[PDB]
Specification:
part of a larger assembly, 3 chains, A alpha+beta (213), B alpha/beta (135), C alpha+beta (101), A: 213 residues, alpha+beta, 8-stranded mixed sheet, 8 strands, 24% helix, elongated, B: 135 residues, alpha/beta, 5-stranded mixed sheet, 2 helices, binds zinc ion, RNA-binding, disease variant (chain C)
RNA sequence: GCGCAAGACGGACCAGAGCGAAAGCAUUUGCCAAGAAUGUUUUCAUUAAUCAAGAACGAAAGUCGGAGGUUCGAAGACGAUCAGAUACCGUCGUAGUUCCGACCAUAAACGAUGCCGACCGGCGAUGCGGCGGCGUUAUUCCCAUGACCCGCCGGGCAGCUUC
């Protein structure tokens, strides 16, 4: 009869200004007929894109979520929505004869975004260690978790989303948590494994053009 | 037909491959997973129930998907490999290997491959019993 | 008569150990009695790597692996030839099989 | 694919590792009372060991009322296999599985090995507390403090070897 794809317009997807590469791909949506508006159709789509496809000179085990808020004439504009690591990365990091330490915080940014951040870290074996295991005592991991919980709070509460994201691209929060925990028990693979977005402010068109330069 | 793109540029889709021990799904959608382009299973090709999980049936499914994708400008695919997950098995089915060759031999370009099987942090009781399946 | 000094387990100095389900039967097995295997495999086998890199848009792309922990009951480890039977003295050898060679 | 809700469950880290009188105990944080071991040139000064009677707790299943009911699932209804199947396999599914309050007092409740005390061979590890000692590391320093390294002492879970 008729190919249902003959009623579909293609749109390009743009990443915000924090990333070097802006074009991330294309989507499609059925055209408008009455009260069936395409622009209302493609608002709210989430794209999970590897960091290496946004920063061509970065790691490929980090992923960012981008959600569409507007459609400005064949281009749909996205905003930060979440972040997480890869299953391969996590499963490779989890090993046996060491200890895992994890934490989670809820922090609201200055500009009104509420985020839940998760952090992970693993105990490290020494160069001259003869023993098989490198476990940490229970009060040693309550100190480490306390330090993860306060560094994540201060580095999100102080600043807004645009420059919070610029701290996630190189993962500078985990690098600070690693430095500040070697006097308790040296840590090995410290990452912000996940960032989840809870609440949003009332949408403003003025502040989305800023995020696209 | 398809996007108006220069010849030297790749247009990416996403291939969800769900390989269980009873069937195999090959499911190509756009980059968001919201609009699907094509879906072919093993049961759509063969007529015997025992061959739905066959590696051969997963080959005729990915060739009929790659043919349809090479009709709308979809030139490259990101691969999301799935097992049943949950309480049940975490290992992909026999048709999992033969579906990554049928769509590669067909002429597609391969992006990034990732496992998307569902692992519970901890879950409900599994079927069977405390003595399991006695056959 | 008693066969093993450890009763076929690893339980020492505790009363109860939480059970798990066999990967093959869905049978309840104590965690210290189950036969456990960590499998790190490749997603694509050597029969498909030559057809995967020629279609890859990234130069020098490293293909991912797959990490699965498998638990067996005593019956499936024997049926699937994961674990064999062995002589009375050899039973006391608890060194892992020389696969790492 | 994006959300919403319901109940159950705390994976991977997780070990011949730890705690408890035994049943038993695993997401974060806070509160509450409890406990072993080690340290001690503190204190009392025999206050102790085992125990008829009599008591506290006691997996799972099971019984009474309230609440809720995701998953699994005795009984039951079916579809297969079979010479026959009232079974093993599969589709549903009641009581139950969960919580609150009362009963029940049983397990291959097992180390199939009562409790307290003394003596009798070695060796390497491991968990906790203490003591000593080159040297690495917390970036370049002050000391303590942590993570390694080499030993000693006490109390624990175990292992190897022995005419
Ligand atoms: Zn089994």
């Amino acid at each position: 009869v008729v190919d249902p794809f003959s009623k579909k317009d293609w749109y390009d997807v743009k990443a915000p200004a924090m990333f070097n590469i802006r074009n991330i791909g294309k989507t499609l949506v059925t055209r408008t007929q009455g009260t069936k508006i395409a622009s209302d159709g493609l608002k709210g789509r989430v794209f999970e894109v590897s960091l290496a496809d946004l920063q061509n000179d970065e790691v490929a085990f980090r992923k960012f979520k981008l959600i569409t808020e507007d459609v400005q004439g064949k281009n749909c504009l996205t905003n930060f929505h979440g972040m997480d690591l890869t299953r391969d990365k996590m499963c490779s990091m989890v090993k046996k004869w060491q200890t895992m330490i994890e934490a989670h915080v809820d922090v609201k940014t200055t500009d009104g975004y509420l985020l839940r951040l998760f952090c992970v870290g693993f105990t490290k074996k020494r160069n001259n260690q003869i023993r098989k295991t490198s476990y940490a005592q229970h009060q040693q991991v309550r100190q480490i978790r306390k330090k993860m919980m306060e560094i994540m709070t201060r580095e999100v509460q102080t600043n807004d989303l645009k420059e919070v994201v610029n701290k996630l691209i190189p993962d500078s929060i985990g690098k600070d948590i690693e430095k500040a925990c070697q006097s308790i028990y040296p840590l090995h693979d410290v990452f912000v494994r996940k960032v989840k977005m809870l609440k949003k402010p009332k949408f403003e068109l003025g502040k989305l053009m800023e995020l696209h330069g | 037909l398809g996007p108006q793109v220069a010849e030297g540029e790749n247009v990416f889709g996403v291939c969800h491959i769900f390989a269980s021990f009873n069937d195999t799904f090959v499911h190509v959608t756009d980059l968001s997973g919201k609009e699907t382009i094509c879906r072919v299973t093993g049961g759509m090709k063969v007529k015997a129930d025992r061959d739905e999980s066959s590696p051969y049936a997963a080959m005729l499914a990915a060739q009929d998907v790659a043919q349809r994708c090479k009709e709308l400008g979809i030139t490259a695919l990101h691969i999301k490999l799935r097992a049943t997950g949950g309480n049940r098995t975490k290992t992909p089915g026999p048709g999992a290997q033969s579906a990554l060759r049928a769509l590669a031999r067909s002429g597609m370009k391969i992006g990034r491959i990732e496992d998307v099987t569902p692992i519970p942090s901890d879950s409900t009781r599994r079927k069977g019993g405390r003595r399991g399946r006695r056959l | 008569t008693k066969k093993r000094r450890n009763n076929g387990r690893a339980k020492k100095g505790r009363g109860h150990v939480q059970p798990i389900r066999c990967t093959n039967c869905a049978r309840c097995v104590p965690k210290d009695k189950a036969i456990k295997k960590f499998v790190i495999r490749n997603i694509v086998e050597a029969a498909a790597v030559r057809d995967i890199s020629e279609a890859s848009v990234f130069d020098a792309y490293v293909l991912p692996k797959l990490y699965v922990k498998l638990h067996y009951c005593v019956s499936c480890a024997i049926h699937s030839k994961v674990v064999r039977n062995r002589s009375r003295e050899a039973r006391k050898d608890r060194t892992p099989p020389p696969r790492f060679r």
